[PDB]
Design a protein around this nucleic acid. Structure first.
Ligand SMILES: [Mg+2]
Length: 756
DNA sequence: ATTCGCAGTTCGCG
DNA sequence: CGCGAACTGCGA
């Protein structure tokens, strides 16, 4: 199968390299015949002779147009003629494309910012990660000597650990009495030993945790300091470092550097993304943290080095375990989008859709629109109305059914053919008209995006049912991941429509989807109220909670099923209302905030403090305890005692500090903040010292007993010391626990002073 | 560098 | 003092 592609230059000419793994054998294929190109729209065909002679210069070398040819393509449905301009080397394109655009007779240029290697995959119809080839993977991690006021990588690497199917080992240059530790003489020897391991194991995938922004950078500075050729690549090359906006990314030629950090960041939602928290949430098993201070202290005193080595070992071990858990899913996502695992695992929603569309556009001879320039970008800051949210009838309800649409937004796009190439298209014999916004969509032919979206949803269903019949457990897992990958991509189309940087951006399409959605959800609600006598307790966008307050559980279920039969006969196209679940009880606090419990006793919570990371565990824990007492036991006076118990424990300082940590994300550069909240205050004190802060950093702090604002009393939890610090019991009672619980017990008539 | 709608806290202004 | 901007993270 295909892992990746790139190009090298030989005698001034680009040579594509295709990196493959066939039958457990690494292979490189070379292609010297692929020509870089982009398109130009001319107002006059005669102008082509002027464009041929346009020249530029890269670095002394003179850039010219190799050859041209007129081609006929489609642009948003309508037919168009443009000139395909070829060049000798892909680096000629960025050097001359501006000179060609600025030419008077050139209306516009297209597809001029597509990387050569990616252009090759699309044009040749090649799909990475296709097949059942098993990749050999290796995880690794490092431990370092940290001192507070030093430069990056001023301290040596203390240990390098790695892990695969054979287990986990640690390389270090001090004597450690553990069976999985290999001892060498120096840091230099340790690094060289690691090179040999990678060379001999020859893994297809190198797995790290935050290796893009720490590990490889640290190794690089150290190899420079020690004079080592850090040749990790299968071609003898050193890791290549690239700039991805305000962050970094690292390739290793011939293999795939799989950094788990950006992947897990997108896949699951956690309060913090430390390696310990991630592992404990995914595998449900604890992992002890050993801090930089303890590591430094252990290395200098020579004392607890076993503890450090074990931590180093577990880092590599869990990294390998997590890599095994997340990689196959990302691999199937890569195959779907049609780009390398390296790019896909580091790409967000916007880029993934765009690359998929770019490939499909080529297959359909569809000329792709350009990225918006700064002027057009500012013109796309106009917003639109979103989903409908009913104000809930607040309180505790009995025997509730939840009904919702199966894929509401994708169903709308397919059913009503919503697409920029069908928008207000004149000359058609059939149209659908969006409510409120009034946009018309041609129904005569499948639109580009609804066509692709329809194939995706259809393919997904064919995979779901083939899974049930697939005996081979490995094939079933593969199909499961592809099916999940399709769901992710299919649900990304709507948001992409309203994404201002998108090539196929269309605000009219985006607001038409939401307008139609508001219509269908509101029609369905008044339908079940008027014709079946249900009370609709609450509704958000694509579903609602309903019940008959004076009815039996089986009575509610029966009537709900009858309603479903009724409205589904009225719904057009692919729209379908479904029976999502029945709930014994439910408590609806506000819009976006509620909790329900099924007949098994399982509680599901939305929006409440319990779900959020910017609330201490102590507040979330008793809110969950209160909610359980109400939903499962129906015991309101028990919920009260629990709060009295918790506030008393807090006031007497019997609560562990670990359950008092508050987590809050830094979203921008610290200088760009206008209002300084507690987490920003803590961040600025950190940045004042050694530690640098990036947008995406989660600040974990605790509030201390003292004077001043909350931000003046807040410190990072790592630095909390019982001998130096005392947490603010009053704060965690009056600002954390009580507000979170009072908002629930308010409905029963309890004040804050009813619980102290 | 996917969308909009919404509850809630901290802090500073008048 | 009330009040609103700034800010975060959630639901769909
Ligand atoms: Mg709103």
């Amino acid at each position: 199968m295909i892992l990746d592609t790139d190009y090298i230059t030989e005698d001034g000419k680009p040579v594509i390299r295709i990196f493959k793994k066939e039958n457990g054998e690494f292979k490189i294929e070379y292609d010297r015949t692929f020509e870089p190109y982009f398109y130009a729209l001319l107002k006059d065909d005669s102008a082509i002779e002027e464009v041929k002679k346009i020249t530029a210069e890269r670095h002394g070398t003179v850039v010219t147009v190799k050859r041209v040819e007129k081609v006929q393509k489609k642009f948003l449905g309508r037919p168009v003629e443009v000139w395909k301009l070829y060049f000798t080397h892909p680096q000629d394109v960025p050097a001359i494309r501006d000179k060609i655009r600025e030419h008077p007779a050139v209306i516009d240029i297209y597809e001029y910012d597509i990387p050569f290697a990616k252009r090759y995959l699309i044009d040749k119809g090649l799909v990475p990660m296709e097949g059942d080839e098993e990749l050999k993977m290796l995880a690794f991690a490092i431990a370092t000597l940290y001192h507070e006021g030093e430069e990056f990588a001023e301290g040596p690497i203390l240990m390098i650990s790695y892990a695969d199917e054979e287990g986990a080992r640690v390389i270090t240059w001090k004597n450690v009495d553990l069976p999985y530790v290999d001892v060498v003489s120096t840091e230099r020897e340790m690094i060289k030993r690691f090179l040999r391991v990678v060379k001999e194991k020859d893994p297809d995938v190198l797995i790290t945790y935050n290796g893009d922004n720490f590990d490889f950078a640290y190794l690089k500075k150290r190899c420079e300091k020690l004079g080592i050729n850090f040749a990790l690549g299968r071609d003898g090359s050193e890791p290549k470092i690239q700039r991805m906006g305000d962050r970094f990314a690292v390739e290793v030629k011939g293999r795939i550097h799989f950094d788990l950090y950006p992947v897990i960041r997108r896949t699951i939602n956690l309060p913090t993304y430390t390696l310990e928290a991630v592992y404990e949430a995914v595998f449900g098993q604890p992992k002890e943290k050993v801090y930089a201070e303890e590591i430094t202290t252990a290395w200098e005193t020579g004392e607890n080095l076993e503890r450090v080595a074990r931590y180093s070992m577990e880092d590599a071990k869990v990294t390998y375990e997590l890599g095994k858990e997340f990689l196959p899913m990302e691999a199937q996502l890569s195959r779907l989008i049609g780009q390398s695992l390296w790019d896909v695992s580091r790409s967000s929603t916007g880029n993934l859709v765009e690359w998929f569309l770019l490939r499909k556009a080529y297959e359909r001879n569809e000329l792709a629109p350009n990225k918006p320039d700064e002027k057009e970008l500012a013109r796309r800051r106009q917003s639109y109305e979103g989903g409908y949210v009913k104000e809930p009838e607040r309180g505790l309800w009995e025997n509730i059914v939840y009904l919702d649409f199966r894929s509401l937004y994708p169903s709308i796009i397919i059913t009503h053919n919503v697409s920029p190439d069908t928008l207000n298209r004149e000359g058609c014999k059939e149209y659908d008209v969006a409510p409120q916004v009034g946009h018309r969509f041609c129904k005569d032919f499948p639109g580009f995006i609804p066509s692709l979206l329809g194939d995706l949803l259809e393919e997904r269903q064919k995979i779901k049912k083939k899974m049930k019949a697939t005996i081979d457990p490995i094939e079933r897992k593969l199909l499961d991941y592809r099916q999940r990958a399709i769901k992710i991509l299919a649900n990304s189309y709507y948001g992409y429509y309203g994404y201002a940087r998108a090539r196929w951006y269309c605000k009219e399409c985006a607001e038409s989807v939401t307008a139609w959605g508001r219509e269908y959800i509101t029609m369905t609600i008044k339908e079940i109220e008027e014709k079946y006598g249900f009370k609709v307790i609450y509704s958000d966008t694509d579903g609602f909670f309903a019940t008959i307050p004076g009815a039996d559980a089986e009575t509610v279920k029966k009537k709900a099923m009858e309603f479903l039969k009724y409205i589904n006969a009225k719904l057009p196209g692919a729209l379908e209302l479904e029976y999502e679940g029945f709930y014994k009880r439910g408590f609806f606090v506000t819009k976006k905030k509620y909790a329900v419990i099924d007949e098994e006793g399982k509680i599901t919570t939305r929006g409440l403090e319990i779900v959020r990371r910017d609330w201490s565990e102590i507040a979330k824990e008793t809110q969950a305890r209160v909610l359980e007492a109400l939903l499962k036991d129906g015991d309101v006076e028990k919920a009260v005692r629990i709060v009295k118990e918790v506030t008393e424990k807090l006031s007497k300082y019997e609560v562990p500090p670990e359950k008092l940590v508050i987590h809050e994300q830094i979203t921008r550069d610290l200088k760009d903040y206008k209002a300084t909240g507690p987490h920003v205050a803590v961040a600025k004190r950190l940045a004042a010292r050694g530690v640098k802060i990036r947008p995406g950093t989660v600040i974990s702090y605790i509030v201390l007993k003292g004077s001043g604002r909350i931000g003046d009393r807040a410190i990072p939890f790592d630095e909390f010391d019982p001998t130096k610090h005392k947490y603010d019991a009053e704060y965690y009672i009056e600002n954390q626990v009580l507000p979170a619980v009072e908002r629930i017990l308010r409905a029963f008539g309890y004040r804050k002073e009813d619980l102290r």
